[PDB]
Curated annotation (Swiss-Prot), chain A:
The keyword Protein biosynthesis applies. This is Tyrosine--tRNA ligase. It holds the Pfam family tRNA-synt_1b. SUPFAM superfamilies: Nucleotidylyl transferase (SSF52374). Transmembrane segments: none annotated.
Length: 306, 301
């Protein structure tokens, strides 16, 4: 359970913890995650790669899908441009400390046997359910394309084709994963990570919303981005600064300050920080300052490698 | 970070800025005094862990084994106390501490040492000496000799850092007043005994010894003071705070929410204060974690 603790920690749900126990009893086990290549890799990506590294340390072989064909179907551009971004993304994930098997979706998702099962699955997936599964994933389209409903079926089939025991993704993948659990002969365990709040507090962090910290942002950019961030005094949920403190910072954490309010604060844990903030013993401005400097240092090794 | 490793789980540092200055030097030392004890318990272990923190931050560690004080306080003959102290040395080594050891009797009766005690006695008012002892103490002459003896011992050691309990606070402040070299003082908390009636001591069933068997640990924790919802003065919660590693998992039935993974002591504290974690499940968890923490020590002894 030191391993299992490593896995469950900071996830939103595991479907199911029962089945996940049975998986852990094996000398060979594999876990996969896919990412549409993105020109900006931000903290939401980093959270998920941290979880893949967790799974690695519990004895899992890790597969990262650079999902060039998914990004193509989801209107991100032409394959050759997308693949270039994918190669950059691979370098960022490696810089994050993940040594894994990096594979382009198009290396397997065009195989005759893959496609034939996409077509089998299409006969069993309603249009309603396919479109519903994409509400949090599909690029906004006034006039939605056929591509949008092929995408979730292709994703269902990826775990079947590769024979992985565990699929990891953000909570926005939840509906595809439930479809996958109903349709495939072997259940695969699904681990869902939280979705970070955008820096302005409006909805989720996204490469296309301009409301994110990128792992390669400069110190000066990170300070500017945190200083303008939404950070309501004493409110924790939907507060992206507190989310950063929860999911990325290392404790103990020293928050310097003059003796005239409370003096220097050595914070033992995120929970201590949460108490201090909810009781308004720590002001948003001082929280932001400390979080900016700590995140700059956490991200420095990734920056240095790119 | 080195400062944070030294501060964690201390009661006070006199002073933090001075500590940060010491941390810049490439050669630095810290001392602590222990009266030799036939059983080494978690109260001792708390203080040795703090010397290990210092050792890991580059300090050379000196342990003063206080055999003269023990001899004067009626704990036996000096040769008998030496045998206990030599055992304590093996326990501290098993705990991970690499230190130099000195017995009080090896320096504190030397002629030039004694003359300096008397020099300090001539300089030091009874009023100031009594004030330094107000907390530790028909008062005896011994009461005012103790503080000037402690000051002289700090002068004789010449360490950068002194470590002890808040009980020693006023002695440490007198050392800082009277001596040219300003020693940095680190004060550690004390542990409640398993009975909840005072500080951990060698009273029957009132301590966990670091070499207690797993069954002895389970039996003592089972009958310890641990009232529902109470964190203050709760020795089981203090053990979770000062010795356990986080995160940790508490098995709990699904109708309560299922197994608990607690990220930190503070998360444990809120849960227990709220009666969201029952004393018997806290006790069972703390006992099993503590057994695992102590096992490498037990096996080296
Ligand atoms: N939906 C994910 C992307 C993702 C997740 C899991 C996968 O197995 C995955 O790749 C397979 C795939 C799924 C859907 C369409 C195309 C492909 N493809 O690249 O061949 C992509 C995202 O939102 O970035
Ligand atoms: Ca025994
Ligand atoms: Cl002594």
């Amino acid at each position: 359970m030191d391993e299992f603790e490593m896995i469950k920690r900071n996830t939103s749900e595991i479907i199911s913890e029962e089945e996940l126990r049975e998986v852990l009893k094996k000398d060979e086990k594999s876990a996969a995650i896919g990412f549409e290549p993105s020109g900006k890799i931000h903290l939401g990506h980093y959270l998920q790669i941290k979880k893949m590294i967790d799974l690695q340390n519990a004895g899992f072989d890790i597969i990262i899908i650079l999902a060039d064909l998914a990004a193509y179907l989801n209107q991100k551009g032409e394959l050759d441009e997308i693949r270039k971004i994918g190669d950059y993304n691979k370098k960022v994930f490696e810089a994050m400390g993940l040594k894994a098997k990096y594979v382009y979706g198009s290396e397997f998702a065009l195989d005759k046997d893959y496609t034939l099962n996409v077509y089998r699955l299409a006969l069993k997936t309603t249009l309603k359910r396919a479109r519903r599964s994409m509400e949090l994933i599909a690029r906004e389209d006034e006039n939605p394309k056929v591509a949008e409903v092929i995408y979730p079926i292709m994703q269902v089939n990826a775990a079947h084709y590769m024979g992985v025991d565990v699929n990891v993704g953000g909570m926005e993948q939840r509906k595809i994963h439930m479809l996958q659990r109903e349709l495939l002969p072997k259940k695969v365990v699904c681990i869902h990570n939280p979705v970070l709040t955008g820096l302005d507090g409006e909805g989720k962090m996204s490469s296309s919303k301009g409301n994110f910290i990128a792992v390669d942002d400069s110190p000066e950019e990170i300070r500017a981005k945190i200083k303008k961030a939404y950070c309501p005094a004493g409110v924790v949920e939907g507060n992206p600064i507190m989310e950063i403190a929860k999911y990325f910072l290392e404790y103990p954490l020293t928050i310097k300050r003059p003796e005239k309010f409370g003096g220097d604060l050595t914070v033992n844990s995120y929970e201590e920080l949460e108490s201090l903030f909810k009781n308004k013993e720590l002001h948003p401005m001082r929280l932001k300052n400390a979080v900016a400097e700590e995140l700059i240092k956490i991200l420095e090794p990734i920056r240095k490698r790119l």
